[PDB]
Amino acid sequence: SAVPFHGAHQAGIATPVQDRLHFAAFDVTTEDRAAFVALLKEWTAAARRLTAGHAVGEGAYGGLPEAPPDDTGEALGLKPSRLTLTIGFGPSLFTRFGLADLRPEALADLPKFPGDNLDRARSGGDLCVQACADDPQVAVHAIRNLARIGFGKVVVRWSQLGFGKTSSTTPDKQTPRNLLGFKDGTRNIAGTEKDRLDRFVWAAEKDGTPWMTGGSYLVARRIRMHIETWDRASLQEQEDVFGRDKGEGAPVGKAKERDEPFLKAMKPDAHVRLAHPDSNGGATLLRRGYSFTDGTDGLGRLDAGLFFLAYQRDIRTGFVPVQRNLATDALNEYIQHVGSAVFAVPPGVRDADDWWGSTLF
Amino acid sequence: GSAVPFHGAHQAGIATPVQDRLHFAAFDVTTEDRAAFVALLKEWTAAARRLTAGHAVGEGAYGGLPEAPPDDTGEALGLKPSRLTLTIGFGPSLFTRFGLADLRPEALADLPKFPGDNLDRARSGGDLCVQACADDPQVAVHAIRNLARIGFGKVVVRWSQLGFGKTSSTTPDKQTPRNLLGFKDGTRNIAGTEKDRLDRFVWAAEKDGTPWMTGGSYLVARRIRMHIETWDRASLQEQEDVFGRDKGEGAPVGKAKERDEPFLKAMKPDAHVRLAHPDSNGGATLLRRGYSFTDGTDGLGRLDAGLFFLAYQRDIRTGFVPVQRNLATDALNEYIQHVGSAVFAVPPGVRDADDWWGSTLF
Ligand code: HEM
Ligand code: HEM
C-alpha cells in the first residue's frame, strides 16, 4: 500500500507501475540559489509526509483558525496508494545559480525529428515532479500542495494526467492495452532485472558526472493519436503497423504474446521491428508511460494519446537512436508528437537528513 | 468490478452508487432523417447492452474479416465491466427536429441567466448527452469512443468532460468523498435506497403532464471553475464559515459528527449549506452526482481545477432553479465561476431486451 521513499535511487522508476499519473513541469522564478535550496528541503520534507499518506506541515485542520491550513485537505481519509514522487532537473535549470558547468553531457538536447509538431507551452521546463499513485486524487493532491509550497519560487508550466490499468479489477502481470487496442509493454525493462537496470537505466560514476551517480535521464513526449483515422483502418493494417496481432499480441508467425519476435517476418517499417534493440545497435529503454484522454478538440475529435516516458542511462544512446530509427515507422500515419521535455533525475534521498538535489547543490 | 444491470423502469447511472470516474459527452445531431435517428438509437442500445456487460460491441474486436475494421476498437479487451453505466439524455434543441416540438416537456425548462455566469457557448448546450460512469477510466472512454464511432454521420460530439474522481454520494453508508476545496461533498444527498424520496424529488410521474417521461428524470450540468489560488490563501476559519461545516469531520458547525443534522441558525447567513438546504428553499431537494476535473494549467503558472456539477430532479423549475436562485448571496461565489451549462431530459429505463432508448418518445 506504500512504497519506501528513501533509497539509493529515487522511487517511481524501477518500482511497480501504479495506476495513475500526474506529471507536472515547473519553471523557476527566483535567482537566489539559497532560496532555491531552501525550497528543495521543504519539498523533500513534504514528500516524506505525502508518500506515507500524511498531511504536509501541521495538517489540513486543527491549527490556528486565523491561518490557512498547511495542507489543502483533499486527500484526508485516503491511503498512500503507492504514491511515489520523482523529481528531475531540465537543461534550462543549469543556466541559473551558476550551474552551467555541472550540466551532464548525457542530458542532451533532443534533435528535431521528422513530423514533430511541438507545442512550446507544453514542452520543456526547469524541473519536473512525476507523481504516480493508484488513486488519481492522491497524485493531484501531491502536485497541488508542492506547487502551493513553492509559490513565489516556482510556477507550474504544464501538467498532464494519465492512467494505466485499474488494479482493483485487472491482474498484475496481465499486459495493459494502449488506446489503439494493442498490448503495450511486452518487451520492456522490468524493475526486477537489476543487471539490465545497471547497464541501461542508472547513471554510473564513470559515465562522467559524479553528482548523477544513481540517477537517470528522462524523456517525456506527449504523443497524440489520430483515433478516428486509426479506427477506420482494417484489422490487417493495424496488425501490420505493429508486427503483432491485436487479440493475443504475438509477434507475427508466433502464437503467444511473450514469444520472442522474428523480425524478418514483420514488414520493414513495422513499429516493433524498428524499435527492437537488434535494429538499434542494442539500445534498450525502460518505458514507463501512461495513456491520456483530455477531452475533445474543436472538431469533435478525441484528444487522446500516449504520454510517453522513457528512462535511460544516457539520452544519446537510448531515446535518440531509437526515435531516429522511427523516421519511417508505419505508425507515423496515426500519431503526432506535440510536446517534449528532457530531465536529469538525481540519485535517491538516502535517509531522513538527505534532500532532493543534495549531490548537485 | 461487477456489472450494474442495464434494464429497469429507470436508467442506471442516477440512483446507482456513484462510480469512481466520469466521461460525459454531449452530441449534436446531423441528420434530418427521423428513421435514421431511430435506427441509431436501437443500435446504440444494442451496444450499451454489450458494453455494460463487459462484452465487445458488434462482432468483437478481432478475428473478423482481415480487410475490414474491427467492430469494437479493442482497448477494453480483458477488462471487467467495472460498474459501467450509460445514461442518455435529450437536450431542448433536439425537439426542434423530427417534428418533436409538441413533445418537449414543460419540466425541461431553459435556465435563466444567473449573476456571475460566464458560460462558454462551445462547452454548453447539446442535442443529447451520454453520461458514462465506471470505476476504470479506460472502460468509460472505450464506451464513448464506440458510441460516437457508431453514430458517425448522424451525430457529432459537441463537447465532452472527463471527471477524474467523484464529489458525490448516493450511498451514505460509505465514506463521503472530498472535492478539491478539501471538504466532504455528498453528506446530505438522496440515497439510492430512499425509494420514497426518489419518487418525490427525482423521478417524473405520469401526472406531471409529459407521459413519455414517466420514470425518467431531468439533468442540469454546470461546469464550475474553482479559484484555488484565492481559496488556498484563505484562513481555516474563513473556509469553514463559507460552508457551515468544519473541514476535518465535516460536521455542521457546533456539532460533533458529519451526519448530525445541521442547525441552520448557528451558521453564517451567507453560508453555502444554510442557503442550499431544503428548509431554506421550500423543501426543494436535489440528487447531486458531480465529479472533480483538472484540465492542465491556466497558462498563468497555476493548476486549473474545478467541479463538473450534475443534479437530477423531477422538475428543473422546482429543483435546480429555486436553489441556485437562493445561492445569489452564497459566500462560495467568491471562489467559483460557472463556465458551462446544459439541461437534458433523461428518459425512462430500457424495460427489456426488446426495448430501446427513447422508444417512449419515438
Ligand atoms: C503512441 C505512441 C506509441 C505506441 C502506441 C507504441 C506502441 C507499442 C507497442 C504496442 C509495442 C509492442 C508491445 C511492447 O513490446 O511494448 C511497442 C514496442 C516498443 N516500442 Fe512503442 N509505441 C509508441 C511510441 C514509441 C516510441 C516514441 C518509442 C521510442 C522512441 C517506442 C519504443 C518501443 C520499444 C523500444 C518497444 C520494444 C520493442 C521490442 O524490443 O520488442 N515506442 N510499442
Ligand atoms: C464547486 C461548487 C460547489 C461546491 C464545492 C459545493 C460544496 C458543498 C459542500 C462541501 C456541501 C456540504 C456537504 C453535503 O451535504 O454535500 C454541500 C452541500 C450542498 N450543496 Fe453544494 N457545492 C457546490 C455547488 C453547488 C450548487 C451549484 C448547488 C445547487 C445549485 C449545490 C447544492 C448543495 C446542496 C443542496 C447541498 C446540501 C445541503 C443540505 O441539504 O444540507 N452546491 N455543497
Side-chain angles (χ1 to χ4, degrees):
Chain A
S1 99
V3 165
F5 175 75
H6 295 110
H9 314 289
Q10 288 193 67
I13 305 169
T15 49
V17 189
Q18 309 99 310
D19 290 0
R20 314 293 176 233
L21 166 80
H22 197 182
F23 196 100
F26 298 77
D27 286 334
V28 174
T29 56
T30 184
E31 301 173 359
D32 180 3
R33 183 188 192 116
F36 186 65
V37 167
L39 175 60
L40 286 171
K41 296 175 172 176
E42 253 203 282
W43 268 12
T44 307
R48 284 189 186 106
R49 294 277 191 67
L50 299 161
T51 53
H54 304 318
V56 309
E58 302 166 41
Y61 63 92
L64 277 157
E66 314 82 19
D70 281 345
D71 188 292
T72 60
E74 74 267 21
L76 279 165
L78 309 178
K79 313 164 331 204
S81 298
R82 299 187 306 167
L83 173 68
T84 57
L85 290 167
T86 310
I87 181 159
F89 303 137
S92 50
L93 183 63
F94 300 88
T95 73
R96 284 179 186 261
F97 319 123
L99 300 161
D101 57 0
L102 285 172
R103 175 178 169 181
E105 294 198 86
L107 182 65
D109 305 303
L110 298 178
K112 220 260 181 202
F113 292 98
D116 272 355
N117 188 34
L118 302 184
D119 184 334
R120 59 219 63 53
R122 298 176 129 150
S123 302
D126 294 325
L127 61 87
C128 68
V129 182
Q130 166 192 285
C132 309
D134 292 324
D135 183 325
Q137 182 139 331
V138 171
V140 172
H141 170 264
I143 300 294
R144 193 261 201 76
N145 277 262
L146 293 178
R148 183 169 175 255
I149 282 161
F151 209 54
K153 306 189 193 194
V154 306
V155 295
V156 181
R157 179 189 184 82
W158 59 262
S159 172
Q160 180 69 63
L161 252 55
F163 49 89
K165 67 167 49 155
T166 299
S167 290
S168 60
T169 57
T170 313
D172 175 51
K173 311 176 113 84
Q174 160 165 304
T175 316
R177 285 172 188 271
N178 62 47
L179 288 178
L180 306 173
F182 275 73
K183 295 183 181 175
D184 201 329
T186 303
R187 283 176 35 79
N188 194 7
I189 293 182
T192 48
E193 325 179 86
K194 295 265 231 165
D195 54 353
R196 298 183 83 209
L197 297 165
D198 276 347
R199 177 174 289 103
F200 292 115
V201 179
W202 304 125
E205 203 212 55
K206 56 164 178 173
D207 290 348
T209 311
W211 71 262
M212 269 296 300
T213 308
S216 192
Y217 299 91
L218 173 65
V219 173
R221 301 282 276 202
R222 188 187 191 260
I223 308 174
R224 173 74 167 278
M225 303 161 160
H226 302 307
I227 295 303
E228 294 84 7
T229 304
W230 173 259
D231 288 345
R232 300 203 271 263
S234 74
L235 168 60
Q236 190 56 256
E237 293 165 72
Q238 295 191 6
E239 299 189 334
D240 284 342
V241 155
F242 283 103
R244 294 166 177 273
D245 68 274
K246 192 163 200 194
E248 168 68 6
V252 57
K254 303 307 184 69
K256 293 163 92 273
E257 165 194 357
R258 301 212 172 261
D259 280 344
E260 289 300 298
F262 183 50
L263 297 181
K264 244 72 203 173
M266 304 175 190
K267 314 261 140 184
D269 289 319
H271 176 81
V272 172
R273 187 169 161 170
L274 298 161
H276 192 283
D278 288 1
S279 300
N280 295 282
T284 312
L285 298 177
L286 197 161
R287 286 171 294 143
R288 209 182 193 272
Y290 286 81
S291 294
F292 71 89
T293 309
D294 288 2
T296 38
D297 65 20
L299 319 153
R301 288 178 301 162
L302 251 193
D303 186 356
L306 181 72
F307 186 65
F308 180 84
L309 297 169
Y311 286 97
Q312 62 264 286
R313 172 181 192 182
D314 191 316
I315 287 175
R316 298 165 299 178
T317 60
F319 181 83
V320 163
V322 179
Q323 175 64 36
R324 191 167 277 145
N325 220 49
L326 301 190
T328 56
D329 194 354
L331 179 69
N332 284 341
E333 177 171 358
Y334 307 99
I335 64 169
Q336 180 167 71
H337 297 232
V338 298
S340 177
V342 297
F343 306 92
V345 177
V349 187
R350 292 156 23 112
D351 65 24
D353 300 328
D354 206 4
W355 37 286
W356 276 342
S358 47
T359 66
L360 169 60
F361 293 95
Chain B
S2 44
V4 181
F6 180 74
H7 298 140
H10 308 299
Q11 297 198 62
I14 303 168
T16 313
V18 179
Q19 309 98 317
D20 285 337
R21 312 278 311 209
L22 165 83
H23 190 150
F24 189 105
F27 296 80
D28 292 327
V29 177
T30 65
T31 170
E32 311 272 24
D33 186 343
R34 173 205 261 241
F37 189 69
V38 160
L40 165 60
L41 282 168
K42 301 204 194 159
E43 244 191 297
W44 269 11
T45 314
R49 276 186 195 102
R50 300 291 280 174
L51 291 162
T52 52
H55 310 313
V57 302
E59 303 217 48
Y62 58 94
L65 290 153
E67 64 264 20
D71 275 349
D72 192 291
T73 57
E75 76 267 23
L77 257 162
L79 300 196
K80 323 264 193 79
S82 311
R83 299 202 293 165
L84 174 70
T85 59
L86 295 172
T87 312
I88 189 174
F90 297 133
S93 62
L94 179 81
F95 297 85
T96 67
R97 302 177 152 257
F98 317 122
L100 312 171
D102 303 324
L103 288 174
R104 167 188 189 161
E106 282 272 84
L108 185 60
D110 286 299
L111 305 159
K113 50 225 266 180
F114 298 100
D117 273 355
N118 189 24
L119 308 173
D120 181 354
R121 272 198 57 162
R123 324 261 331 260
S124 311
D127 284 336
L128 54 80
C129 65
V130 169
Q131 170 193 277
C133 289
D135 294 321
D136 183 328
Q138 195 145 323
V139 167
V141 170
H142 172 263
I144 301 293
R145 176 190 185 164
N146 280 269
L147 287 182
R149 189 170 170 253
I150 289 179
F152 183 74
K154 301 178 188 188
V155 292
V156 59
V157 177
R158 179 184 182 89
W159 58 266
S160 65
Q161 179 71 64
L162 285 84
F164 70 81
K166 69 199 165 154
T167 53
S168 52
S169 166
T170 56
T171 52
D173 51 297
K174 307 250 162 284
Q175 184 171 47
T176 309
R178 306 194 174 245
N179 51 45
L180 292 181
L181 304 183
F183 280 75
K184 291 175 176 174
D185 214 326
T187 309
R188 288 193 22 93
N189 202 34
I190 298 170
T193 61
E194 295 176 310
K195 216 210 97 80
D196 278 43
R197 300 186 81 212
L198 290 161
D199 294 332
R200 194 195 194 189
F201 292 120
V202 174
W203 301 129
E206 312 96 290
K207 43 170 297 314
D208 296 353
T210 302
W212 70 269
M213 268 295 291
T214 308
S217 187
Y218 295 94
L219 175 58
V220 180
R222 305 279 293 200
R223 196 172 187 269
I224 307 173
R225 187 178 301 300
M226 292 165 165
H227 301 141
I228 56 156
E229 167 176 3
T230 318
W231 175 260
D232 279 355
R233 73 172 176 263
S235 79
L236 178 63
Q237 181 73 69
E238 281 164 320
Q239 291 175 11
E240 292 185 338
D241 282 344
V242 161
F243 282 112
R245 291 178 180 272
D246 75 290
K247 202 167 184 179
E249 176 69 14
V253 59
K255 286 181 168 205
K257 297 281 157 177
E258 178 193 343
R259 298 217 163 264
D260 289 345
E261 277 303 339
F263 187 76
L264 297 196
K265 281 65 38 168
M267 302 179 183
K268 297 281 205 72
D270 59 355
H272 183 74
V273 162
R274 185 176 186 162
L275 299 160
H277 195 277
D279 284 355
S280 304
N281 294 273
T285 307
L286 307 172
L287 197 157
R288 286 170 294 134
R289 214 170 187 286
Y291 283 78
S292 302
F293 72 83
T294 176
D295 293 358
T297 61
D298 58 8
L300 301 155
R302 305 174 308 179
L303 294 179
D304 168 281
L307 196 148
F308 188 66
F309 179 92
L310 303 164
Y312 289 87
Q313 64 275 278
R314 178 172 167 176
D315 188 335
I316 295 180
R317 301 168 295 182
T318 66
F320 178 81
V321 179
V323 182
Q324 173 72 23
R325 285 221 254 247
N326 215 50
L327 291 193
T329 57
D330 192 349
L332 184 54
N333 288 336
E334 164 87 7
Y335 303 99
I336 62 154
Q337 181 169 62
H338 296 236
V339 294
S341 174
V343 300
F344 306 90
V346 181
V350 180
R351 305 292 321 222
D352 45 42
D354 262 298
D355 201 4
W356 41 283
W357 272 341
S359 65
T360 72
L361 175 74
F362 298 94

